[PDB]
Amino acid sequence: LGGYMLGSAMSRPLIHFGNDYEDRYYRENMYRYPNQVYYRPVDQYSNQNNFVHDCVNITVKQHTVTTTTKGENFTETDIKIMERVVEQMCITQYQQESQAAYQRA
């Protein structure tokens, strides 16, 4: 995460899931299964999806590993979250960071 540009609070996708319970649950969880990720600045790398699974590996983790110490832990739902919000969002970077990392490079 040190050599990983924080994905400046992502696009806070808020997957909503189709369940306002979970819609709410991400809006509530966005400070943990959240609207932020860590990754390096990818000019879409013809596969940010790649750096994604690695970013979900850093971000859900930083929130369930350096953060499980705060008392904050995920469940496969909570993870299905970081995988829906983060695997998707970092994937969004596959298309979206070719924009931003084009900009920032």
Side-chain angles (χ1 to χ4, degrees):
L1 284 74
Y4 284 51
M5 48 153 298
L6 185 164
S8 298
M10 288 159 49
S11 51
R12 54 65 163 273
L14 291 166
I15 312 300
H16 39 274
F17 179 72
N19 201 333
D20 74 283
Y21 180 103
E22 273 176 77
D23 163 87
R24 152 277 267 220
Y25 190 54
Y26 311 147
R27 96 169 57 194
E28 102 161 71
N29 86 43
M30 232 78 297
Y31 306 90
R32 64 268 337 222
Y33 324 134
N35 62 326
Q36 59 177 149
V37 274
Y38 304 81
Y39 64 117
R40 211 185 143 163
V42 51
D43 180 58
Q44 98 102 211
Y45 244 76
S46 50
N47 204 333
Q48 163 55 27
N49 164 211
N50 194 91
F51 277 50
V52 177
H53 206 74
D54 190 55
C55 95
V56 229
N57 257 269
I58 53 67
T59 235
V60 326
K61 253 53 118 53
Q62 85 130 207
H63 278 117
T64 188
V65 318
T66 307
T67 287
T68 20
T69 225
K70 176 270 290 292
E72 176 152 82
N73 40 217
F74 70 79
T75 174
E76 214 182 63
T77 294
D78 286 4
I79 224 15
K80 83 185 179 83
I81 292 187
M82 259 147 320
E83 300 205 84
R84 70 191 327 92
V85 214
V86 171
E87 176 80 73
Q88 183 65 270
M89 234 284 332
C90 275
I91 250 58
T92 236
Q93 306 156 206
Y94 167 65
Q95 39 162 270
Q96 92 154 333
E97 188 74 27
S98 70
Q99 316 184 149
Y102 162 70
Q103 141 77 212
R104 66 182 305 138

Coordinates of all heavy atoms in Angstrom, one line a residue, residues 1 3 10 13-14 17 20 25 31 37 42 44 47 49 66-67 74 77-78 81 83 89 92:
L1 N 0.8 -1.2 0.0 CA 0.0 0.0 0.0 C 0.9 1.3 0.0 O 0.4 2.3 -0.3 CB -0.9 0.0 1.2 CG -2.2 -0.9 1.1 CD1 -1.8 -2.4 1.3 CD2 -3.2 -0.5 2.2
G3 N 3.6 1.7 -1.9 CA 3.8 2.0 -3.4 C 2.6 1.9 -4.1 O 2.6 1.5 -5.3
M10 N -12.2 6.4 -4.6 CA -12.9 5.7 -5.7 C -13.9 6.5 -6.4 O -13.8 7.7 -6.5 CB -13.5 4.4 -5.2 CG -12.4 3.3 -4.8 SD -13.0 2.0 -3.7 CE -14.6 1.6 -4.4
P13 N -18.8 3.6 -5.5 CA -19.8 3.0 -6.3 C -21.2 2.7 -5.6 O -22.2 3.0 -6.1 CB -19.2 1.6 -6.7 CG -17.9 1.6 -5.9 CD -17.5 3.0 -5.8
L14 N -21.1 2.3 -4.3 CA -22.3 1.9 -3.6 C -23.2 1.0 -4.4 O -24.2 1.5 -4.9 CB -23.0 3.2 -3.1 CG -22.2 4.1 -2.1 CD1 -22.9 5.4 -2.0 CD2 -22.3 3.4 -0.7
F17 N -26.7 -3.3 -4.6 CA -26.9 -4.7 -4.6 C -28.2 -5.1 -5.2 O -28.3 -6.2 -5.8 CB -26.7 -5.3 -3.2 CG -26.9 -6.8 -3.2 CD1 -26.0 -7.6 -3.8 CD2 -28.1 -7.4 -2.7 CE1 -26.2 -9.0 -3.8 CE2 -28.3 -8.7 -2.7 CZ -27.3 -9.5 -3.3
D20 N -31.8 -2.6 -0.7 CA -31.6 -1.4 0.0 C -31.0 -1.6 1.4 O -30.4 -0.8 2.0 CB -32.9 -0.6 0.2 CG -33.8 -1.2 1.2 OD1 -34.5 -2.2 0.8 OD2 -33.9 -0.7 2.3
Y25 N -26.0 -0.9 3.5 CA -25.0 -1.6 4.2 C -23.6 -1.3 3.7 O -22.7 -1.3 4.4 CB -25.3 -3.1 4.2 CG -24.4 -3.9 5.1 CD1 -24.3 -3.6 6.5 CD2 -23.7 -5.0 4.6 CE1 -23.5 -4.4 7.3 CE2 -22.9 -5.8 5.5 CZ -22.9 -5.5 6.8 OH -22.1 -6.3 7.6
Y31 N -16.8 2.9 5.0 CA -15.6 3.3 5.8 C -14.8 2.1 6.2 O -14.0 2.1 7.1 CB -16.2 4.1 7.0 CG -17.1 5.2 6.6 CD1 -18.4 5.0 6.5 CD2 -16.5 6.5 6.3 CE1 -19.3 6.1 6.1 CE2 -17.4 7.5 5.9 CZ -18.7 7.3 5.8 OH -19.5 8.4 5.5
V37 N -9.6 2.5 -2.2 CA -8.8 1.4 -2.5 C -7.4 1.8 -2.7 O -7.1 3.0 -2.7 CB -9.2 0.6 -3.8 CG1 -10.2 -0.5 -3.4 CG2 -9.7 1.5 -4.8
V42 N -2.3 3.0 -13.0 CA -2.4 2.2 -14.1 C -3.0 2.9 -15.2 O -4.2 3.3 -15.2 CB -3.3 1.0 -13.8 CG1 -4.6 1.4 -13.2 CG2 -3.5 0.1 -15.0
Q44 N -4.5 1.8 -17.3 CA -5.3 0.7 -17.6 C -4.6 -0.6 -17.9 O -5.2 -1.7 -17.9 CB -6.3 1.1 -18.8 CG -5.9 0.7 -20.2 CD -6.6 -0.5 -20.7 OE1 -6.1 -1.3 -21.4 NE2 -7.9 -0.6 -20.3
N47 N -5.0 -4.3 -18.4 CA -5.6 -5.2 -17.3 C -5.4 -4.6 -16.0 O -4.5 -5.0 -15.2 CB -4.9 -6.6 -17.4 CG -5.8 -7.7 -16.7 OD1 -6.6 -7.4 -15.9 ND2 -5.6 -8.9 -17.1
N49 N -7.9 -4.8 -14.1 CA -8.6 -6.0 -13.5 C -7.5 -6.9 -12.7 O -7.9 -7.5 -11.7 CB -9.3 -6.8 -14.6 CG -9.7 -8.2 -14.3 OD1 -9.7 -9.1 -15.1 ND2 -10.0 -8.4 -13.0
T66 N -5.0 -4.9 9.2 CA -4.4 -3.9 10.0 C -5.6 -3.2 10.7 O -5.5 -2.5 11.7 CB -3.7 -2.8 9.2 OG1 -2.8 -3.4 8.3 CG2 -3.0 -1.7 10.0
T67 N -6.8 -3.6 10.3 CA -8.0 -3.1 10.8 C -8.9 -4.1 11.6 O -9.8 -3.7 12.3 CB -8.8 -2.4 9.6 OG1 -8.1 -1.2 9.2 CG2 -10.2 -2.2 9.9
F74 N -14.6 -8.7 8.1 CA -15.6 -8.9 7.1 C -16.1 -10.3 7.1 O -15.6 -11.2 7.8 CB -15.0 -8.6 5.7 CG -14.0 -9.6 5.2 CD1 -14.5 -10.9 4.7 CD2 -12.7 -9.4 5.3 CE1 -13.6 -11.8 4.3 CE2 -11.8 -10.3 4.9 CZ -12.2 -11.5 4.4
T77 N -20.2 -11.9 2.8 CA -21.1 -10.9 2.4 C -20.4 -9.6 2.5 O -20.4 -8.8 1.5 CB -22.3 -10.7 3.4 OG1 -23.1 -11.9 3.4 CG2 -23.1 -9.5 3.1
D78 N -19.6 -9.3 3.5 CA -18.9 -8.1 3.7 C -17.8 -8.0 2.7 O -17.2 -7.0 2.4 CB -18.4 -8.0 5.1 CG -19.4 -7.7 6.2 OD1 -20.6 -7.6 5.8 OD2 -19.1 -7.5 7.3
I81 N -19.0 -7.8 -0.7 CA -19.0 -6.3 -0.8 C -17.7 -5.9 -1.3 O -17.7 -5.4 -2.4 CB -19.1 -5.8 0.7 CG1 -20.5 -6.1 1.2 CG2 -18.8 -4.3 0.7 CD1 -20.7 -5.4 2.6
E83 N -15.7 -7.1 -2.9 CA -15.4 -7.7 -4.1 C -16.4 -7.2 -5.1 O -16.1 -7.1 -6.3 CB -15.4 -9.2 -4.0 CG -14.3 -9.6 -3.0 CD -13.8 -11.0 -3.3 OE1 -12.9 -11.2 -4.1 OE2 -14.3 -12.0 -2.6
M89 N -14.8 -1.8 -8.6 CA -14.3 -0.5 -8.7 C -12.9 -0.4 -9.3 O -12.6 0.4 -10.2 CB -14.4 0.3 -7.5 CG -15.2 1.6 -7.6 SD -14.2 2.9 -8.5 CE -12.6 2.5 -8.0
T92 N -13.4 -0.9 -12.6 CA -13.8 0.4 -13.1 C -12.6 1.2 -13.5 O -12.5 1.8 -14.5 CB -14.7 1.2 -12.1 OG1 -15.9 1.5 -12.8 CG2 -14.0 2.4 -11.6

